[PDB]
RNA sequence: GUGAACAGCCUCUAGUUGAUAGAAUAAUGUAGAUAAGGGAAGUCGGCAAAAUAGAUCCGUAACUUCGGGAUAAGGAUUGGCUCUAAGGGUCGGGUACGAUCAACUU
RNA sequence: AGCUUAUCACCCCGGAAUUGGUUUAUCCGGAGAUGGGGUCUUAUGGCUGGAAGAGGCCAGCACCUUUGCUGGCUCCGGUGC
RNA sequence: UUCAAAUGAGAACUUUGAAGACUGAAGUGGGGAAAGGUUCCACGUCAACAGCAGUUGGACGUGGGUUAGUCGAUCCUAAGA
């Protein structure tokens, strides 16, 4: 709200660093069942509820 | 000729919407202006003489381009 | 190319809104290389981006309309659309009227034209009516100082 | 900013062992009709405030400029 | 066709017209007939206070003083100045009945003209005295 | 009281180019300068004298530098020299003529 | 700017030119209008629409708790352009005016 | 930051009916009016310092160019329901 | 809403210039409180989304960016916990 508390801010920083696609080299491992970042977030689609 | 210059001035100005562009900030092309001064009757011999570490997190894992 | 940046960016440098700055179409490669404010000052002053000075809003008809208002035209009953109290309130007339009759009597009393006994009667008679305007009161002083003189003769 | 009228008072302030830099500024103004004449201002930088000295005469400036202490760094314009 | 012309200029809402008003001032009888009408209940001024030029009844005698001092009534005075435009002005323009038309312009210049101008000059003296 | 001012115009730069002549210019001023209303109402209030390169106007009357600029833009429009010749102030009450940026 | 006005209408600084488009103008629509003569005969019913409107002056009833009713009702007028009259300050008078100066109201 | 500036309020001398002063708005006076001479609050204003070196408007050279450099002027008023 | 030019495999829709209009200072303007959390800016770039289109975007990919003795919180108390 541009007057934010630090506890509110620290959870933005964790959500910012999770806002990424999956790395390209994890496609290449052995027995990779993981395909896409299925916990991907967006500010438009889903509010993160503080 | 007085009706033509008035008819010529209608398509030029359009003052009510924006502006007329300043002649000082713009520049001429030698071009048309020697054609215009020929119609006034001045000779153009004299004025011709003056003309004469980014670290992409996707692809820093695999180095070779084939992979 | 895409030039929404330099259109916006030259507006910040010259200090005029985005509707005013002019980017010539002949220099479409020279402008697109500039991606900093420091290049834009150089691109402005050598004559690629200019100012496009202000759209005219003349006031010639307004002055020539108001000049006839001084002479007393456009003032009939057809032009008016408000009451007299909306146009000129009766308190504002009374305040202009009744401060004149206070400071006229103030300057006669100090100059010695009138004594303090006749001041205090013309003071309260001016608080009501019977002195409509400035000329009508000075005529009353002439009559009253004549009536004072004619009684003094007898 | 303080304005100082006394020439004597200003001479002590350059000697106060607190002032490191000074500056002289030359201005060109007018008396009522008069003549165009130069005007000088002497500014000394204390720790707290900026002391100034307005000399309207051109002749007294040449007298006072030499009277500055030599270790005191002087700026011109 | 429009909105405003149909409001004022229907056949129901028609005034007398400029012909008959000139004939009323042409003689001394009809001047004194129209001024001194008998009182009638349907009429607006109860058959009193009637202007001859503008064929229109006024309510109060004060409503004549404000009516005679105005650009509406000064208009109808200027309208009734010349030859009153009968049918004979229209036919004389085509080249038809000149001597019928030329006798009428001769009479109105000589005979009826200054007699009408005397009758209007006595109305302005009569309405001055009663008001 | 009515202390006169000297107003100088340099016309040397269009004179050599030949599109302009200074002699017809100096005649154009002496009748059109309006002293209190009507043209020609001046009785020796102004003088218009020319070098051939320098036109000099000395006026005791009410006469201003913008108004002197106003008359020269009247004259260049009649001769169709506008779009090409401008009227600049180099120093105060001293004026000269110039072409624009003709460059291709 | 018009005007009683931060109304409505038009413009300057600033901002936008986004809302799927192209061609034709059948019926029926939704939105907005005009109509000869008669004027509510229409209809559950004057629903709706038309009419009146700003402003100065004249003028105003029954009734009334005397304050209201009241903008009751009703009636004259309004543009333009040249004019005249009235309405002010600041200065000069031995302890009547003259000068200069600037406003929009009727 | 410096110097100066005000309605209100306050003190001194003085003793007032033939009542006086005074606001658009009628209140004040022997519990001391009007008047004459003074003190104070500094909302606020004026000038000087800050501060023209800044900013603004133009003109002139430079020039692939880091892009600057050099000049001028930056003044004085008026009015209000 | 219109015309040319550039960009492009491609243009009713992107960029620039020339036109035409509109919001008309109780605005389609300039900032902020709740609320959202990187949307802000640059570089690359169009399979999906933007109910037409797309070279463009609040999309996608990678990075860059919020500096305080004086502005706020922190201190005090209100109804109240």
UniProtKB/Swiss-Prot annotation, chain B:
TM helices/strands, residue ranges: none
Parts forming coiled coils: none
Localization per record: Nucleus, Nucleolus
Note: Present with 28000 molecules/cell in log phase SD medium.
Family note: Belongs to the TRAFAC class OBG-HflX-like GTPase superfamily. OBG GTPase family. NOG subfamily.
Quaternary state and interactors: Associated with nucleolar and cytoplasmic pre-60S particles. Directly interacts with RLP24.
Functional description taken from the UniProt entry: Involved in the biogenesis of the 60S ribosomal subunit.
Protein name: Nucleolar GTP-binding protein 1
Organism per entry: Saccharomyces cerevisiae (strain ATCC 204508 / S288c)
Residues included from the entire protein: 499 to 598 of 647
UniProtKB/Swiss-Prot annotation, chain C:
Gene Ontology cellular component list: cytosol; cytosolic large ribosomal subunit
Cross-link type Glycyl lysine isopeptide (Lys-Gly) (interchain with G-Cter in ubiquitin), residue numbers: 20, 52, 59, 145
Coiled-coil regions, chain positions: none
Composition skew (Basic residues), residue ranges: 58-67
Keywords associated with the record: Cytoplasm, Isopeptide bond, Phosphoprotein, Ribonucleoprotein, Ribosomal protein, Ubl conjugation
GO MF assignments: RNA binding; structural constituent of ribosome
Chain's role: Component of the ribosome, a large ribonucleoprotein complex responsible for the synthesis of proteins in the cell. The small ribosomal subunit (SSU) binds messenger RNAs (mRNAs) and translates the encoded message by selecting cognate aminoacyl-transfer RNA (tRNA) molecules. The large subunit (LSU) contains the ribosomal catalytic site termed the peptidyl transferase center (PTC), which catalyzes the formation of peptide bonds, thereby polymerizing the amino acids delivered by tRNAs into a polypeptide chain.
Entry similarity comment: Belongs to the eukaryotic ribosomal protein eL19 family.
Protein name: Large ribosomal subunit protein eL19A
Species of provenance: Saccharomyces cerevisiae (strain ATCC 204508 / S288c) (Baker's yeast)
Lineage of producing organism: Eukaryota, Fungi, Dikarya, Ascomycota, Saccharomycotina
UniProtKB/Swiss-Prot annotation, chain E:
Coiled coil segments of this chain: none
A GO CC term attached to the entry: nucleus
Main location group: nucleus
Further details from the record: Present with 5630 molecules/cell in log phase SD medium.
Keywords: Cytoplasm, Metal-binding, Nucleus, Ribosome biogenesis, Zinc, Zinc-finger
One of the record's GO molecular function terms: nucleic acid binding
UniProt name for this protein: Bud site selection protein 20
Zinc finger (C2H2-type): 49-73
Organism: Saccharomyces cerevisiae (strain ATCC 204508 / S288c)
UniProt GO BP: ribosomal large subunit export from nucleus
SUBUNIT field: Associates with pre-60S ribosomal particles; released from the pre-60S particle very early in the cytoplasm.
Localisation: Nucleus; Cytoplasm
Motif (Nuclear localization signal): 7-16
Domain of life of the source: Eukaryota
Annotated spans, Nuclear export signal-like (NES-like): 17-31
Protein family according to the UniProt entry: Belongs to the ZNF593/BUD20 C2H2-type zinc-finger protein family.
Covered residues, full protein: 1 to 131 of 166
Gene from which this protein is expressed: BUD20
Function recorded in the entry: Involved in pre-60S ribosomal particles maturation by promoting the nuclear export of the 60S ribosome. Involved in positioning the proximal bud pole signal.
Curated annotation (Swiss-Prot), chain F:
InterPro entries named in the record: Ribosomal_eL22 (IPR002671), Ribosomal_eL22_sf (IPR038526)
Compartments, record wording: Cytoplasm
A cellular-component GO term for this protein: cytosolic large ribosomal subunit
GO molecular function: RNA binding; structural constituent of ribosome
Pfam families given in the database record: Ribosomal_L22e
Gene Ontology BP terms: cytoplasmic translation
UniProt keyword list: Cytoplasm, Ribonucleoprotein, Ribosomal protein
More about this protein: Present with 60400 molecules/cell in log phase SD medium.
Subunit structure of this chain's protein: Component of the large ribosomal subunit (LSU). Mature yeast ribosomes consist of a small (40S) and a large (60S) subunit. The 40S small subunit contains 1 molecule of ribosomal RNA (18S rRNA) and 33 different proteins (encoded by 57 genes). The large 60S subunit contains 3 rRNA molecules (25S, 5.8S and 5S rRNA) and 46 different proteins (encoded by 81 genes).
Family: Belongs to the eukaryotic ribosomal protein eL22 family.
Function: Component of the ribosome, a large ribonucleoprotein complex responsible for the synthesis of proteins in the cell. The small ribosomal subunit (SSU) binds messenger RNAs (mRNAs) and translates the encoded message by selecting cognate aminoacyl-transfer RNA (tRNA) molecules. The large subunit (LSU) contains the ribosomal catalytic site termed the peptidyl transferase center (PTC), which catalyzes the formation of peptide bonds, thereby polymerizing the amino acids delivered by tRNAs into a polypeptide chain.
Gene, per the UniProt record: RPL22A
């Amino acid at each position: 709200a541009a007057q934010k508390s630090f506890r509110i801010k620290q959870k933005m920083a964790k959500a910012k660093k999770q806002n990424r696609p999956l790395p390209q080299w994890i496609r290449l491992r052995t027995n990779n069942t993981i395909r896409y970042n299925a916990k991907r977030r967006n500010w438009r689609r889903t509010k993160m509820n503080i | 000729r007085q009706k033509t210059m008035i008819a010529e001035a209608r398509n030029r100005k359009s003052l009510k919407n924006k502006a007329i562009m300043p002649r000082s900030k713009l520049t001429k092309s030698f071009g048309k202006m020697e054609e215009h001064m020929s119609t006034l009757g001045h000779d153009m011999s004299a004025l011709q003489d003056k003309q004469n570490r980014q670290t992409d997190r996707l692809l820093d894992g695999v180095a070779d381009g084939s992979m | 190319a895409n030039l929404r940046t330099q259109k916006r960016l030259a507006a910040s440098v010259v200090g005029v809104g985005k509707r005013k700055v002019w980017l010539d179409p002949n220099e479409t490669s020279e402008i697109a290389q500039a991606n900093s404010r420091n290049a834009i000052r150089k691109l402005v002053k050598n004559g690629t981006i200019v100012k496009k000075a202000v759209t005219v809003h003349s006031k010639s008809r307004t002055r020539a309309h108001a000049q006839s208002k001084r002479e007393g035209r456009h003032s009939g009953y057809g032009k008016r659309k408000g009451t007299r109290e909306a146009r000129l309130p009766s308190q504002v007339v009374w305040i202009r009227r009744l401060r004149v009759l206070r400071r006229l009597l103030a300057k006669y009393r100090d100059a010695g034209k009138i004594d303090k006994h006749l001041y205090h009667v013309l003071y309260k008679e001016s608080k009501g009516n019977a002195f409509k305007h400035k000329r009508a009161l000075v005529e009353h002083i002439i009559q009253a100082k004549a009536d004072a003189q004619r009684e003094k003769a007898l | 900013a303080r304005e100082i009228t006394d020439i004597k008072q200003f001479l002590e302030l350059t000697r106060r062992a607190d002032v490191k830099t000074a500056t002289v500024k030359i201005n060109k103004k007018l008396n009522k009709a008069g003549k165009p004449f130069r005007q000088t201002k002497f500014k000394v930088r204390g720790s707290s405030s900026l002391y100034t000295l307005v000399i309207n005469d051109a002749g007294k400036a040449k007298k006072l400029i030499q009277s500055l202490p030599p270790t005191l760094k002087v700026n011109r314009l | 066709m429009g909105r405003y012309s149909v409001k004022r200029y229907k056949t129901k809402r028609r005034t007398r017209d400029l012909d008959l008003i000139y004939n009323d001032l042409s003689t001394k009888e009809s001047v004194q007939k129209l001024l001194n009408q008998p009182l009638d209940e349907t009429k607006p001024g109860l058959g009193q206070h009637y202007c001859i030029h503008c064929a229109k009844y006024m309510e109060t005698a004060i409503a004549l003083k404000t009516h005679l001092k105005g650009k509406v009534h000064k208009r109808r005075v200027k309208e009734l100045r010349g030859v009153p435009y009968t049918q004979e002005v229209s036919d004389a323009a085509a080249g038809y009945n000149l001597n019928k038309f030329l006798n009428r312009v001769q009479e109105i210049t000589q005979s009826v003209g200054p007699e009408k101008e005397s009758n209007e000059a006595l109305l302005k003296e009569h309405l001055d005295s009663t008001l | 009281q009515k202390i006169a001012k000297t107003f100088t115009v340099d016309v040397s730069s269009p004179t050599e180019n030949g599109v302009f002549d200074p002699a017809s210019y100096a005649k154009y001023l002496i009748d059109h300068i309006k002293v209190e209303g009507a043209v020609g109402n001046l009785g020796n209030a102004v003088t218009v004298t020319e070098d051939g390169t320098v036109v000099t106007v000395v006026s005791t009357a009410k006469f201003s530098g913008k108004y002197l600029k106003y008359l020269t833009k009247k004259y260049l429009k009649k001769n169709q020299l506008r779009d090409w010749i401008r009227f600049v102030s180099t120093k105060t009450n001293e004026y000269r003529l110039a072409f624009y940026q003709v460059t291709p």
